[model samples]
Every structure is written in C-alpha cells, then in structure tokens.
Target: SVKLIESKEAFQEALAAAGDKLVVVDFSATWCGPCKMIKPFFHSLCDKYSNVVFLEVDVDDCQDVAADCEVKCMPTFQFYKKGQKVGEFSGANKEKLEATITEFA
Candidate 1:
C-alpha cells in the first residue's frame, strides 16, 4: 500500500522501518491538478515493484516532512535507498518519474 503520512513523526517512523530498502516518496497536494494526474501512475507502480516502499505525503497534511525534504513545489519525488537519499525531482511527468523509479528501485 501507498503509506499516507499524516505527521512528521509518522514519516520518520516509515523511513526508519524502511531501513536500506528502496523508498519512493511522493510529495503532492490535494489542491494540485498535476498531482491528481500523476497519482494513479505512482500507486500502480507498487505491485510492479513490490520490493519498493511507497510513501505519500500530502504537503498540507505533512508540512514538516515536506519542509524536511525541501519540497518547494507540488508533485515532488524523493528517492532513497541504503538509508540515504538517491534522487530528488519535482513534477508530475509519468515517463520521467517511471525512469527514476526504475533506476532506483
């Protein structure tokens, strides 16, 4: 499942539990149109890459986590593996997002 983060503590707990596993964090907003479009594709990826851990952070709901990642815009993707950040990108583009996921998954 795409773990939806509701607070900073929850976000940290998720990451800690993830450990060295590949974690794909989706930083989006319910008010954003582009995020709405990319969201379906993002969630669909979970089964395809079942080994990967997916995290969803609504900017408004997880403000602290969003700020922790320095998410300046909507639809930001933060990739982490081996307990360190591997990639950080902003946008709702499907192919690019998929490419990044493939690279880091």
Candidate 2:
C-alpha cells in the first residue's frame, strides 16, 4: 500500500524521508475542486519524476499538518529539498505546476 501520512507522527516520518529530494506536499480537501483537478497531474508528475517525493496531506483529516505548513488555502502545493522548502504553487493553474515540476526535475 502507498504510505499515507494521516497523523503528526507519520507526517514527521514523511518529512524525514523527504530530505534532499524534490518533495511536493499537497495540502488539499476532499470537496476541493482545484485539489481534485490537480491531483492526477501531481500523481503523473510523481510517477514521471522518480527523484521526487509526492505527498498528499488532506486538510480535513490532517489539520495540524495543514496549520504547521502554513496552508492558508486549499490545494496549496509546498515544495522542499534537502529538508528545506524551496518553492510552491497555489490555486488552480497547471502552467505554473508544470513549470515548477520541471524546475525541480
């Protein structure tokens, strides 16, 4: 099964594992349109870029993580590398997403 980080503990472990790679932590909700719209692309990008860690953090379930990451809006994508945040993409646009993935790739 895919590694699902549903708690603060799992989230911490996930962060530890994501060090030094292009980590994409997706902050989302089940009812979010933009989140749904970008999910497939995120998965696709994840599969395409084996070097990156694609993480999905549900805002509804993991409210602590959402708050810890300073997620102010739904579908906020946070990027990290070497245990440090590098960049991110927000809102419902695919152009910036593709571009950012390329930058990290």
Candidate 3:
C-alpha cells in the first residue's frame, strides 16, 4: 500500500503490476483539507487490508495524472479491479472510506 507514483507511466505500471488485486488510488492535492485529515486513516487501512493495492498521487505534482484520472474534486478516490475501474468517490469520512475499501476488498 501507499506507492508514490512518479509519473503517468509509473502509475500505469502500478495498475498493471497489481494484477487481480483491487487498486485504490487517492488523488490528493496540497490545497485539500480533508485529504490531509484522512491521511492517517488511509494509512490505517493500508495495514488492515493488505490485499488492497494503494497508490498515493499528489495530483498537483503530477498534472498528467490529474488529466489521466480525470480528477474533478479534492481528495478523490479511484478504484480499479483487474485493470478496470470498479468504483470511485470523494471524501474524508473514515467510516465511509473504510466501508468503501471493504466493499471492494
């Protein structure tokens, strides 16, 4: 969990490398408040769900990822399974976040 993406190519490689595992990417920005608050909770989930593949992307740092992932909101999450998107959402609610992870985990 929590792989820092270097570029769009690396991000693509990460998705591909995950194989059949569920990939949860948190598209965060420095300007997002909730994103900062949820960081620790997200880290907690990483330990709880070892089966989940997590990617942390500073969207502002990687504008290519911003466009590639079509990010439209602050602290957005994009879920992928078997190389295809399965679910997506945005928020800092820990319960909702964990439930979302459990939904796909």
Reference-based lDDT, each prediction: 0.87, 0.78, 0.85
Clashes of 1: 0
- Per lDDT, the best of the predicted structures is 1
* Segments in model 1 whose C-alpha atoms lie over 4 Å from true places: none
Q: Which candidate is the best by TM-score?
A: 1
Query: Tell me, what's the RMSD of every candidate?
Result: 1.1, 1.8, 1.2
Estimate candidate 1's alpha-carbon lDDT, on a 0 to 1 scale: 0.87
Clashes (candidate 3): 0
Q: Clashing residue pairs, candidate 1? A: none
Sort every candidate by TM-score, greatest first: 1, 3, 2
Clash counts per candidate, in order, are 0, 1, 0
Give me the runs in candidate 2 sitting further than 4 Å from their true place.
1-3
TM-score of each: 0.93, 0.88, 0.92
